[PDB]
Scaffold this active site. Structure first.
Site, PDB file in Angstrom:
ATOM      1  N   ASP A  45      29.741  23.175 -81.500  1.00 17.68           N
ATOM      2  CA  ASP A  45      29.661  23.538 -82.907  1.00 17.68           C
ATOM      3  C   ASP A  45      28.226  23.352 -83.390  1.00 17.68           C
ATOM      4  OD1 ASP A  45      31.030  20.612 -82.629  1.00 17.68           O
ATOM      5  OD2 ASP A  45      29.591  20.616 -84.285  1.00 17.68           O
TER       6      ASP A  45
ATOM      7  N   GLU B 281      23.211  31.073 -47.376  1.00 20.81           N
ATOM      8  CA  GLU B 281      23.490  30.816 -48.784  1.00 20.81           C
ATOM      9  C   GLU B 281      22.383  30.006 -49.452  1.00 20.81           C
ATOM     10  OE1 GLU B 281      27.178  28.907 -48.225  1.00 20.81           O
ATOM     11  OE2 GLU B 281      28.309  30.757 -47.895  1.00 20.81           O
TER      12      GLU B 281
ATOM     13  N   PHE C 230      43.494  13.321 -94.445  1.00 23.24           N
ATOM     14  CA  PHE C 230      42.182  13.037 -95.013  1.00 23.24           C
ATOM     15  C   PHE C 230      42.240  12.746 -96.509  1.00 23.24           C
ATOM     16  CE2 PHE C 230      38.698  14.946 -97.464  1.00 23.24           C
ATOM     17  CZ  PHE C 230      37.663  14.101 -97.119  1.00 23.24           C
TER      18      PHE C 230
ATOM     19  N   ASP D 255      28.473  10.931 -63.909  1.00 24.02           N
ATOM     20  CA  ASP D 255      29.313   9.753 -64.078  1.00 24.02           C
ATOM     21  C   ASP D 255      29.536   9.025 -62.756  1.00 24.02           C
ATOM     22  OD1 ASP D 255      31.012   7.867 -65.239  1.00 24.02           O
ATOM     23  OD2 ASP D 255      32.786   9.126 -64.941  1.00 24.02           O
TER      24      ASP D 255
HETATM   25  O1  LIG Z   1      32.874  12.547 -65.886  1.00 20.87           O
HETATM   26  C1  LIG Z   1      31.966  13.553 -66.203  1.00 20.87           C
HETATM   27  C2  LIG Z   1      32.544  14.869 -66.683  1.00 20.87           C
HETATM   28  O2  LIG Z   1      33.120  14.692 -67.941  1.00 20.87           O
HETATM   29  C3  LIG Z   1      33.580  15.957 -68.575  1.00 20.87           C
HETATM   30  O3  LIG Z   1      34.801  16.470 -68.064  1.00 20.87           O
HETATM   31  C4  LIG Z   1      36.019  15.735 -68.209  1.00 20.87           C
HETATM   32  C5  LIG Z   1      37.383  16.522 -68.163  1.00 20.87           C
HETATM   33  O4  LIG Z   1      37.652  17.170 -66.949  1.00 20.87           O
HETATM   34  C6  LIG Z   1      38.274  16.313 -65.927  1.00 20.87           C
HETATM   35  O5  LIG Z   1      38.509  16.999 -64.728  1.00 20.87           O
HETATM   36  C7  LIG Z   1      38.146  16.417 -63.484  1.00 20.87           C
HETATM   37  C8  LIG Z   1      39.270  16.089 -62.456  1.00 20.87           C
HETATM   38  O6  LIG Z   1      40.315  17.012 -62.532  1.00 20.87           O
HETATM   39  C9  LIG Z   1      41.391  16.719 -61.539  1.00 20.87           C
HETATM   40  O7  LIG Z   1      42.123  15.536 -61.853  1.00 20.87           O
HETATM   41  C10 LIG Z   1      43.473  15.699 -62.305  1.00 20.87           C
HETATM   42  C11 LIG Z   1      44.416  15.346 -61.186  1.00 20.87           C
HETATM   43  O8  LIG Z   1      43.913  14.843 -60.009  1.00 20.87           O
HETATM   44  O9  LIG Z   1      43.700  16.991 -62.793  1.00 20.87           O
HETATM   45  C12 LIG Z   1      43.926  16.921 -64.233  1.00 20.87           C
HETATM   46  C13 LIG Z   1      43.267  17.986 -65.067  1.00 20.87           C
HETATM   47  O10 LIG Z   1      44.026  18.706 -65.986  1.00 20.87           O
HETATM   48  C14 LIG Z   1      43.395  15.624 -64.604  1.00 20.87           C
HETATM   49  O11 LIG Z   1      43.993  15.133 -65.757  1.00 20.87           O
HETATM   50  C15 LIG Z   1      43.717  14.790 -63.454  1.00 20.87           C
HETATM   51  O12 LIG Z   1      42.878  13.701 -63.448  1.00 20.87           O
HETATM   52  C16 LIG Z   1      40.849  16.752 -60.121  1.00 20.87           C
HETATM   53  O13 LIG Z   1      41.353  15.689 -59.380  1.00 20.87           O
HETATM   54  C17 LIG Z   1      39.422  16.675 -59.990  1.00 20.87           C
HETATM   55  O14 LIG Z   1      38.868  17.995 -59.923  1.00 20.87           O
HETATM   56  C18 LIG Z   1      38.706  15.916 -61.034  1.00 20.87           C
HETATM   57  O15 LIG Z   1      38.724  14.575 -60.607  1.00 20.87           O
HETATM   58  C19 LIG Z   1      39.549  15.636 -66.416  1.00 20.87           C
HETATM   59  O16 LIG Z   1      40.634  16.280 -65.789  1.00 20.87           O
HETATM   60  C20 LIG Z   1      39.778  15.728 -67.814  1.00 20.87           C
HETATM   61  O17 LIG Z   1      40.623  14.650 -68.241  1.00 20.87           O
HETATM   62  C21 LIG Z   1      38.577  15.662 -68.658  1.00 20.87           C
HETATM   63  O18 LIG Z   1      38.202  14.330 -68.787  1.00 20.87           O
HETATM   64  C22 LIG Z   1      32.485  17.001 -68.557  1.00 20.87           C
HETATM   65  O19 LIG Z   1      33.004  18.241 -69.001  1.00 20.87           O
HETATM   66  C23 LIG Z   1      31.941  17.212 -67.272  1.00 20.87           C
HETATM   67  O20 LIG Z   1      30.832  18.073 -67.435  1.00 20.87           O
HETATM   68  C24 LIG Z   1      31.473  15.966 -66.636  1.00 20.87           C
HETATM   69  O21 LIG Z   1      30.309  15.482 -67.239  1.00 20.87           O
END
Ligand SMILES: OC[C@H]1O[C@H](OC[C@H]2O[C@H](OC[C@H]3O[C@H](O[C@]4(CO)O[C@H](CO)[C@@H](O)[C@@H]4O)[C@H](O)[C@@H](O)[C@@H]3O)[C@H](O)[C@@H](O)[C@H]2O)[C@H](O)[C@@H](O)[C@H]1O
Ligand SMILES: OC[C@H]1O[C@H](OC[C@H]2O[C@H](OC[C@H]3O[C@H](O[C@]4(CO)O[C@H](CO)[C@@H](O)[C@@H]4O)[C@H](O)[C@@H](O)[C@@H]3O)[C@H](O)[C@@H](O)[C@H]2O)[C@H](O)[C@@H](O)[C@H]1O
Lengths: 718, 718, 143, 146
Positions: free
Chosen positions: B525, B605, B271, B358
């Site tokens: 934050d 449930e 920075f 999304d």
């Molecule tokens: O899109 C709306 C979403 O955005 C925020 O979260 C994003 C955040 O979390 C993601 O997890 C979802 C994803 O996880 C898994 O996918 C993999 C492998 O298949 O697992 C890794 C995680 O460490 C990930 O990198 C891989 O893609 C799993 O398949 C499945 O449960 C899901 O498809 C994503 O992992 C991560 O990169 C981030 O982008 C927000 O927080 C949410 O509230 C929501 O709005």
């Protein structure tokens, strides 16, 4: 491709990953081959971006690196950071080639651990390169054969067509897989340098650094990772010592995934370095030690390495002379006659060296003037330096001199002639510390002047000892002989100059004992030990306070370089009244010496002075060159103890100290370490006890009263 | 020459020393006047140089400052550092003038705590000045009348004729007289944000920071000094909260003399900032809170302050709607028909808001494309935004949308139209995180484009709720519309840009609930809370893991902004199996919501879910706007507990959690806090127990088996 | 508490192995691994019951528990690891072994031929896994 | 009669005492512990195995207090509450290193595992049948083996 370094009983393993990425694999106990048991499971970590979109499991934020950078997916603290002309700080070092050869090379204008024979060490140079920007980074690794020593440094080189600005150039960086460690550093202050502080790692950034242009008393250039249950005698310990005497940064960082990024080098704060196309930059080296024998086993490896393969001159392996200094004795009020009349008594006492302290040059009657004019004061010394030193030589005594060449006083003849020869910045007030100023060692002219000036003074008399002092930290840091772009390189160029300055002077005089000094151990670092085989430990000459000082100092630096003088009581620093016996024994645990007015000492104390000197020369080989074992810590209780062991384990010397006396105290016993259990030893005054008995059962200490007591035992085989 | 500030029951004292030096004196419990009882004994400290040669006892290295600098005798980490055209970093700030007025002013293009009435606070502006370079620094101090809140910020201005380069511009700095404290920060990661970690201070520098261009999950922008014996209900606590969402540095440094320098502000790493003659730079403020009522007392002043004097809009004091999200339910596989057939069932349960996540825009069938083109996918949403939103409205439910306007994907029409609109540096590979790129908010055109585009999308349908996301940290940070000299301001100008876009959108539409999000609490934050009254806490929706997250999160941020949703089992993050009761109780402890496939749950449930919904609306007024007390920490044992108490202390709600089941477990008791002892309370289902008894004696817990259990109690006065 | 048959098996395998549950309520899938569990124990039963026992990680000190069995002649070894609570995005864990001959190489079934010294001084990495109450079994034999 | 035994292959020292009334008067044993040893120092942690039914023998390491800390059973059995075993361990002694002094009782009834630290930092380690609610009469000529 797998890089496997063998250092003594330890192994340092590295590996190339993917498209020329350098990864860390293992550092610890010696292994024959790393078949990947520690493995390397790749995972797609959230918010850890990828340089390759096709593979989400690869990220620099999650990779153990050897010389990491910031800007490209890695968010931990980088080892280096360079600014391009377009302003970007994004760098991409990739593997180019590597080379392996026997021996150890010297670093350009920098001090380093050396070798006398090719067999002593092996060197691995891995050349990395950023093809786009034409930046060349050479990583240096060295593995000694007898010790667990890995020295690390990097060489930058501009092989491109653009100008490069170094914002950060640390000496090394290593990523540990886990962070279940405690960390030990050496904080302190003037009169209380290098106290051992062990703390648990926090999830974030903890670091030791110095912004005073010196290694400083506040933070010693040394950090070490230790196992949670590692103690004084056992456990895995990972030490990091910086061979540099200026600004440094010793930083440990723990990220989200419990990995520990350990980095060390020149402090990036207030530091930049311009690299014109064709120019190169060399970083000082960092000596790393692994040990399974606790802190003692680690320190002992540092001791032998630093004493025999870092210290230079002809005195590297020679016993250091018992000296007497007149600083605390007379201060400024002295003359020729007052110094010579007592020299006869000191000769009869067995003293081998007499040192003349501050007050011999110019108008040195106070601490507010005359620093820089290195001309003998005819007022106190009619016959001058030549008359005094030769008068002392025929008395069977060596002669020593005190100098502070790095300083310039406002009230001085050289300053009225050259006011812009000091470290300063345009139109800014030049602040004073102890009413003196620091000259600019980044200039070739002043260096050539300083090397030449003091050399004739030191050669104008048969001198065999020199005490180089420095009583100021740099302020308003800047240089007049450097352009607006480079100026921030002055802190480093100052150190590069002094390294060059000392190198020529120490070469001109191989017959002179050089001892570095800075209000005590203000620059007690491996950098100064390379040019001067010993250092004045601390201005605090109180036996009790010295327990804390020496115990902490002995963690990294050998006993041979540990200056220790006996002073008068009540002490001029603390006011504590201690007996001469205990005050002696504490000083006897280092480079023994004296610093007090004998004219005020009684015959009882005077005769005991004779007793102490004769006793030390018998054990001088053991104390200064023997194996050192710390037993009891003054940081952990009311006691302090350590011992010295011979190389053949036939001789040993034990010292014990307890500070505060309690009435009706319980019976204490002391278990010592490092002797041959299969052999018997004769303790003077007690008897011949078995070595195994001494290790497993221990020796009882006699009950004593009064505060600040001490004990010494001589052990000899039969 | 004495500055005495009264903030509620606390005092913040300053004093001018000698020739215009600004010194810190005291911060703690309220005093009428500081006549110098804490005093100020001057001493000549060794190696601490002096700006005044006549006074060796005067040094900037040994005096407690409010905004210290490096270069002039001070060697500690400075609050600021300026680069001159000649390259020097030596600055000499002196007192110019000061002004005092009622109220609290807003910061230029930056979020800050506000006031609705003039009487609530008073502000003191101390104008400092460097006469030589004509640099003026305005120090901002604010005192709330009802709370122990101290906010600090600085305003830099080049009032000279030369260009000045900012190397460091922290928001505040305070020097504590002693260092006998523990320090607590909030480290973590994705799926485990903001864990409270208390560690003892080390002699040197320990710091929590973020270099990810975001507040990050790894290190939350908050630091706090706590007494060694300070607990959850008692003890002195000194909190430091940063109102900023980008790079930050929260650093505490203790020197050789046991003083504690707490500094906080924009991370100086990577920075720099150019100031042409006449322009100014204002840094965000840091809110400091003092409390003698332990950690709870610290949080409670923080809670109400943030909800009433930081959160904005008309929904600042309004009850938050129980929402259901289809992310964890259906992810990307959904259409208009699939949601409407289930919209009827969810309508019957009592949900007040349904959100489309999304997958609705462009070609969002995967997470590797379509980021940036905010146009409805007509294939998945036949009737578009107008048709769908109006369809749910006739069912009596509000409609919400998920957006990530700060993002652009490689596979998007906006990237093919503007490839240089992203953060990048010349000729360097543009690394991807989750196969997407960060837009350049440092550009005015990109900002003007994004504000109008998403607002129209938001106005193309009756929307009343938006969830703003950010799922990647910046890589190759740089801008094409910025000169080679300014470039490093990109990290900051991005946040300045983002602060502006939200500022315009939230102003154009005061009828819409905005909730920030970033893979959980990557940007939880005070900066985001100013523009968006609530934030999605964590993607980890496991009941047990959320116990750890929420307990830590509640330390600084109010309950009203603490998002908590019920998910399905086995959990998508951990795989842990928890009961719907326990999964409910944990989510019931925050901003209640749902996020699971309703098609897969049995009738039992669904009805219990309806009861969960019905139970929450009864107490939602209490939990979200009441005073919050933490009882048992999940970090200190196998249990977790907290409570909500009404303002008049007539109503109360108790939550208890026990994680691991033990056979033949001992009887547990729970002592409550924060209730009015002079009244009796009737616990639903048990009886009317005395208010004094429940706090001093406690309530016995019924023994039950199985893992991850929970209990909830309602308390009401008589 | 609900634990998988693998972990409930592995924990019981650290002593004189046996069963105590309604077998009529078990599926055929669980029954076949049960046969495998029995057959697995008798192969190392001399090793487990008469070998040298090493404790690695204490469940009293953290979330993990591990121990191993080493043969008298230092040619055979069996290692057990246990993890109780699962955390999302957990850091990579590795396990340091003890009691093996550093000057000899060992064949861990399913993994590879790693140096004996490597197993004690460097340690073996654990694969990242989810869910609560997990277990792992390692067989080590000299070559 | 004090019994001491030293195994050749193991670091095992077994201690017990044999009482015998060889006089002409009747003697009442109020306490007859199996062994007792005075350590020169008390700079140790002590390890015992407390617990209960369904949670037997949990390892509990605590620092020594100046006085009496003891684990015992008055249930006529070794009991789940306190297992008949105590051990003195060095402050830095762990699972793999350090000096450890273990004490195991071969008895299935009432026991007392006691460590005592006096004014002079010495450690009195005693172990045997719990003297509480326990006595033994010795008529002239008979003997008692612990
Ligand atoms: O899109 C709306 C979403 O955005 C925020 O979260 C994003 C955040 O979390 C993601 O997890 C979802 C994803 O996880 C898994 O996918 C993999 C492998 O298949 O697992 C890794 C995680 O460490 C990930 O990198 C891989 O893609 C799993 O398949 C499945 O449960 C899901 O498809 C994503 O992992 C991560 O990169 C981030 O982008 C927000 O927080 C949410 O509230 C929501 O709005
Ligand atoms: O010059 C020779 C000397 O240089 C090195 O050490 C010098 C080191 O110590 C100095 O202290 C001397 C002085 O201290 C006391 O006086 C004051 C106040 O009156 O106390 C301050 C220090 O705490 C000091 O600044 C003041 O002078 C004391 O009263 C007095 O008796 C002593 O004479 C000085 O403080 C400091 O700057 C340093 O320069 C070297 O280590 C020595 O071996 C020796 O060569």
């Amino acid at each position: 491709k797998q890089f496997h370094l063998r250092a003594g009983k330890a192994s340092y393993v590295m590996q190339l990953f993917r498209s020329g990425y350098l990864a860390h694999v293992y550092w610890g106990k010696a292994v024959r081959d790393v078949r990947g048991a520690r493995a390397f499971p790749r995972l797609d970590r959230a918010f850890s971006p990828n340089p390759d979109p096709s593979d989400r499991t690869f990220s620099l934020d999650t990779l153990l690196q050897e010389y990491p950078a910031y800007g490209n997916t890695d968010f931990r603290a980088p080892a280096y950071q360079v600014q391009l002309e377009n302003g970007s700080t994004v760098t991409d070092l990739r593997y180019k080639t590597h080379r392996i050869y026997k021996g150890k090379p010297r670093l350009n204008g920098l001090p380093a651990t050396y070798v006398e024979h090719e067999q002593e060490a092996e060197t691995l140079e891995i050349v990395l390169g950023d093809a786009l920007i034409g930046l060349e980074v050479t990583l240096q690794y060295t593995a000694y054969e007898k010790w667990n020593v890995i020295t690390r440094s990097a060489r930058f080189e501009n092989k491109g067509g653009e100008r490069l600005k170094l914002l950060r150039a640390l000496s090394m960086s290593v990523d540990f897989p886990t962070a279940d460690y405690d960390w030990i550093h050496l904080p302190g202050a003037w009169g209380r340098e290098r106290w051992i502080e062990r703390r648990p790692l926090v999830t974030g950034v903890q670091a030791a650094e110095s912004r005073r242009g010196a290694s400083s008393h506040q933070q010693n250039p040394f950090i070490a990772l230790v196992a949670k249950n590692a103690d004084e005698h056992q456990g895995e310990v990972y030490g990091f010592s910086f061979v540099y005497s200026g600004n440094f940064l010793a930083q440990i960082e723990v990220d989200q995934f419990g990995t520990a990024r350990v980095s060390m080098g020149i402090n990036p704060f207030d530091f930049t370095w311009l690299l014109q196309p064709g120019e190169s930059f060399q970083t000082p080296e960092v000596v790393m030690v692994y040990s399974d024998q606790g802190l003692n086993g680690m320190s002992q490896t540092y001791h032998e390495l630093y004493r025999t393969r870092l210290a230079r001159g002809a005195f590297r392996d020679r016993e250091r002379p018992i000296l007497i200094n007149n600083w605390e004795a007379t201060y400024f009020d002295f003359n020729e006659e007052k110094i010579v009349n007592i020299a006869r008594t000191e000769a009869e006492l067995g003293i081998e060296l007499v040192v003349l302290d501050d007050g011999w040059f110019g108008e040195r009657d106070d601490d507010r003037r005359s620093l820089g004019d290195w001309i003998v004061n005819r007022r106190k010394l009619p016959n001058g330096l030549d008359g005094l030193a030769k008068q002392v030589n025929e008395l069977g005594l060596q002669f020593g001199l005190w100098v502070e060449p790095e300083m310039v006083s406002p009230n001085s003849e050289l300053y009225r002639k050259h006011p812009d020869w000091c470290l300063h910045v345009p139109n800014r007030p030049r602040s004073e510390g102890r009413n003196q100023l620091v000259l600019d060692y980044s200039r070739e002219d002043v260096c050539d002047y300083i090397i030449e000036t003091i050399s004739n003074v030191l050669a104008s008399a048969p001198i065999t000892y020199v005490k180089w002092a420095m009583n100021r930290h740099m302020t308003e840091i800047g240089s007049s002989a450097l352009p607006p772009e480079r100026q921030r390189e002055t802190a480093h160029r100052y150190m590069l100059g002094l390294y060059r300055v000392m190198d020529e002077i120490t070469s001109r005089f191989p017959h002179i004992l050089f001892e570095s000094c800075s209000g005590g151990g203000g620059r007690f670092d491996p950098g100064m030990l390379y040019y001067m085989p010993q250092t004045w430990t601390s201005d605090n000459t109180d036996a009790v306070s010295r327990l804390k000082i020496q115990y902490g100092t002995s963690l990294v630096y050998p006993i041979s370089a540990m200056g220790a003088h006996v002073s008068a009581v009540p002490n001029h620093q603390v006011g504590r009244v201690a007996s001469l016996k205990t005050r002696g024994h504490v000083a006897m645990s280092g480079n023994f010496g004296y610093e007090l007015d004998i004219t005020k000492l009684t015959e009882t104390e005077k005769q005991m002075m004779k007793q102490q000197v004769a006793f030390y020369k018998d054990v001088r080989r053991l104390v200064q060159f023997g194996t050192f074992y710390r037993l009891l810590s003054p940081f952990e209780g009311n006691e302090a103890a350590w011992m010295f062991v011979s190389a053949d384990r036939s001789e040993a010397l034990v010292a014990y100290f307890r500070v505060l006396a309690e009435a009706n105290a319980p019976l204490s016993y002391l278990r010592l370490k490092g002797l041959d259990s299969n052999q018997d030893y004769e303790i003077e005054g007690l008897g011949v006890y078995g070595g195994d008995e001494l290790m497993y059962a221990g020796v009882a200490l006699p009950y004593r009263s009064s505060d600040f007591i001490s004990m010494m035992w001589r052990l000899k085989a039969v």
